[PDB]
Design a protein around this nucleic acid. Sequence first.
RNA 1: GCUUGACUGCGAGCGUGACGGCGCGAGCAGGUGCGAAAGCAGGUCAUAGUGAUCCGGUGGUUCUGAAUGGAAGGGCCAUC
RNA 2: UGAGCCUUGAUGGAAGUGUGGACGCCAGUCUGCAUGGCUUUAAUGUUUGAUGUUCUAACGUUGACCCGUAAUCCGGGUUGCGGACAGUGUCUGGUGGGUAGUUUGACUGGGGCGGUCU
RNA 3: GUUUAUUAAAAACACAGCACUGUGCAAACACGAAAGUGGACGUAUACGGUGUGACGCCUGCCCGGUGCCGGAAGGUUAAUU
RNA 4: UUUUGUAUAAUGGGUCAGCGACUUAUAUUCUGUAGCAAGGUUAACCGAAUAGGGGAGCCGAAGGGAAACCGAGUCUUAACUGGGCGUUAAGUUGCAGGGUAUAGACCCGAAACCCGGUGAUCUAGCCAUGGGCAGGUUGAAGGUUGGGUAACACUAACUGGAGGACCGAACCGACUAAUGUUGAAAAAUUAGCGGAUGACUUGUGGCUGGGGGUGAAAGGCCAAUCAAACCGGGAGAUAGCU
RNA 5: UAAGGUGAUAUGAACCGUUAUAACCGGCGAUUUCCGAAUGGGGAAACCCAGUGUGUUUCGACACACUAUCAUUAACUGAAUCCAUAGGUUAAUGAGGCGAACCGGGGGAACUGAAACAUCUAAGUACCCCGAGGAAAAGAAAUCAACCGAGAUUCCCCCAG
Lengths: 149, 70
Amino acid sequence: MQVILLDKVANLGSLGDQVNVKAGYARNFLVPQGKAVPATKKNIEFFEARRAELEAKLAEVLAAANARAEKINALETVTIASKAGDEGKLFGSIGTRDIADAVTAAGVEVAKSEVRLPNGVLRTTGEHEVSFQVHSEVFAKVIVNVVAE
Amino acid sequence: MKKDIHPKYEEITASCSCGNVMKIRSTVGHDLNLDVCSKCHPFFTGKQRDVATGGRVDRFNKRFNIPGSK
RNA sequence: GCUUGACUGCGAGCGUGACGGCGCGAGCAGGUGCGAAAGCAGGUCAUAGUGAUCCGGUGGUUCUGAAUGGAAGGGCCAUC
RNA sequence: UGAGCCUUGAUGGAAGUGUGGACGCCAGUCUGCAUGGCUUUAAUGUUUGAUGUUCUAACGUUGACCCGUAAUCCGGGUUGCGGACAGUGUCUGGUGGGUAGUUUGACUGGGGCGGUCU
RNA sequence: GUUUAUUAAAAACACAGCACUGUGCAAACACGAAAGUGGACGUAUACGGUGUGACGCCUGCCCGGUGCCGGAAGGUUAAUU
RNA sequence: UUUUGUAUAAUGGGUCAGCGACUUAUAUUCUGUAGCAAGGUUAACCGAAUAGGGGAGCCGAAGGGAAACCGAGUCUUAACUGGGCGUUAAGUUGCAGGGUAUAGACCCGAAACCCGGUGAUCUAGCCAUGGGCAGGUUGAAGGUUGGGUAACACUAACUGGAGGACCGAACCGACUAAUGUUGAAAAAUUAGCGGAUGACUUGUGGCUGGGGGUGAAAGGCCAAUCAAACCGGGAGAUAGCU
RNA sequence: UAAGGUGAUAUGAACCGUUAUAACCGGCGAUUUCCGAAUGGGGAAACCCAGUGUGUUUCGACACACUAUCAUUAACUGAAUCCAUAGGUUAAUGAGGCGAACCGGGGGAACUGAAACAUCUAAGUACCCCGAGGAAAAGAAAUCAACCGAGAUUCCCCCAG
Ligand SMILES: [Mg+2]
Ligand SMILES: [Mg+2]
Ligand SMILES: [Mg+2]
Ligand SMILES: [Mg+2]
Ligand SMILES: [Mg+2]
Ligand SMILES: [Mg+2]
Ligand SMILES: [Mg+2]
Ligand SMILES: [Mg+2]
Ligand SMILES: [Mg+2]
Ligand SMILES: [Mg+2]
Ligand SMILES: [Mg+2]
Ligand SMILES: [Mg+2]
Ligand SMILES: [Mg+2]
Ligand SMILES: [Mg+2]
Ligand SMILES: [Mg+2]
Ligand SMILES: [Mg+2]
Ligand SMILES: [Mg+2]
Ligand SMILES: [Mg+2]
Ligand SMILES: [Mg+2]
Ligand SMILES: [Mg+2]
Ligand SMILES: [Mg+2]
Ligand SMILES: [Mg+2]
Ligand SMILES: [Mg+2]
């Protein structure tokens, strides 16, 4: 019931809660890989000396990662036919690759771990919407289209 | 059997009823594993309760600086 | 008719039991009731109507109460 | 969907014509709006107990793949499916001749049946 | 066909057949403190347990009692707070 | 010996020789005896070891009451009476003995329970790998051909060769009778008897362990042992019985 | 140390010795087949089979010597995955097995007694398992006392049946 997120995530706390927090929730998730917390003397005081060099992120880091929706929007139509066929269906697999890999059709590269589409995409050919989800802080927009060959 | 961080138990006892049973009791605690070390990453210790809660006030590191050293 | 002796505290001396125990009992002390009074009353005419101990329950008491003052608990008396 | 605090409500700018919700011992008043000169109790915040939803991240995997490795074991990794379930430990109600330890009297014209044990 | 080696060879055990019941596979069930193994490198035309005992014609009435199967609204009810 | 009672035809002993059963430890109490005496006596230990030293302590000279408490008195009761228990009983420490207590407690003896090991060279199942079955019989399914059907079925022969099939040696087993019964033999011999291509029979080796195994089931088998194996231990179990 | 002496059941044969390296006794060594923790692998124990090195070599060979497994450290190699680990190799240390009892500890009966039997007893005994020493164990108060004080543990006699 005592942690220090600092990196708020829907939790009733930001910059790290100094008062009664959740427990057992962090033992395996929050703390690991997520936002380490131990609100125990040692780690506590160490949070005070902070966090300009660590806060400069929301100003600087956010910027070095927010231009996403701006760097990639006017993009030329993504022309990656997904083997449209089968009397009106397709052959190509539309999931993670063609979505992201649709950018290095000229050079630029991305990470397949940023896609935003709950349901898998129906193997169509229409205006495959691709809401690029680089980071929670910033979302982008991409598209995908299938053609006949 | 383990609960490594802390000793363990598995000591016997007699489970009396209404007056008396000269029977025997024993095996306790439990297990679990997969503990993420802030350092590289998790080796799965099979601690148990009183062992798991111990890794908290303590460390994860000192809680391991023994199962190695000694 | 009037009442509460179906009293409380003791008991000379006896009877009867292997024992535990059981029974009879004049007389004494404090207070009673009935009788003018002598006096009678310590449950029923008598003999069956019963359960030892332990573990406890309830009330009473400065008996005791583990450093001391209390208390819990123990004793003692009454009773389940 | 209950309940605790308790947050906002109904009992305990100067006249007239009107509209709505309120309840009745009933003949009535309550109460917003134009022109006109603390408790009984409801909603939101919540804290917390319930069922039920979904998620991954503990946990399972006697699915697949990769190494250790010219292993069917095991471990690590990736991936899938399951998922706070399952299962385990402590505690607890069932059930429990599956097993175990025992009890199941005496008198008596043998014993047993019957009868009797003060 | 089997059985009491050493007093019983049988009408007893078994049998093929029949029926009930359980088991969705990490199966039920069994050995095992566990890991693991058998069942089975099988998967309901399969595997287990119970009873009947080729075959023929059949197998009637009772669900009160006990057991088992379903329900689980209401009553009673453990730890726990 | 045991009995009311035994020459008893109730028990025990063929005979001889040797061995064979009230002990031992500490505690408690009586008796005798010795020491000392309202006092008696030390324990461990020390030690110029049976001395001497050591009196921690144990017992007695006071008892009554549940106790506080009082005290040759004290409890009882409100009682100052009576009644209960006490009050001019010498104890104490050794030694030897009678008894008791805790112990194996005079000696011998169970059927059993518990703990840990040894056993599947017998036997019961099962696993792996090998072997055996003289001879004679019956003669299914399938097929060839003739017939026959529009085509089949159906049939006739011939071929064919099945079967927990038939008869019968080996082999396996045990229904009957005699003999044996201090046997040739701790289950057999003799004459018959059942199965004998099968749920058959057998060699070698392996796997199941005792409350456990295996079991076509008899509580059968698990080394001449089985309603819980053998060996060692708890163990001198316990034995109101002989 | 010494006149004898070559162990015993039996001499006997062949011998060694008397001065001081003959015996015989004591110390330190040398050797010490095969099996056995058995350790190179296997194995019905005292047997079977190999790898890698060696010397003498009439230069095939004989035997010899090393090579078990774990743990600590060292260095070198090193996966899925850059790293890093996992793993691997080598080497030096060390362990391993026996062992009578006492000792610490983990597990733990029943007969028996209670004149039956469940609480209770027997007894934490028997036993089985692990470990260590010459003793082990315990040990310098979060001890006790009772308003005075004592002063770690241990063992002995009392307190007391
Ligand atoms: Mg009368
Ligand atoms: Mg029974
Ligand atoms: Mg018994
Ligand atoms: Mg009788
Ligand atoms: Mg037959
Ligand atoms: Mg027989
Ligand atoms: Mg017979
Ligand atoms: Mg039948
Ligand atoms: Mg007689
Ligand atoms: Mg005679
Ligand atoms: Mg004699
Ligand atoms: Mg008197
Ligand atoms: Mg035949
Ligand atoms: Mg005869
Ligand atoms: Mg014959
Ligand atoms: Mg025949
Ligand atoms: Mg054999
Ligand atoms: Mg036998
Ligand atoms: Mg004994
Ligand atoms: Mg005996
Ligand atoms: Mg060797
Ligand atoms: Mg070897
Ligand atoms: Mg008894």
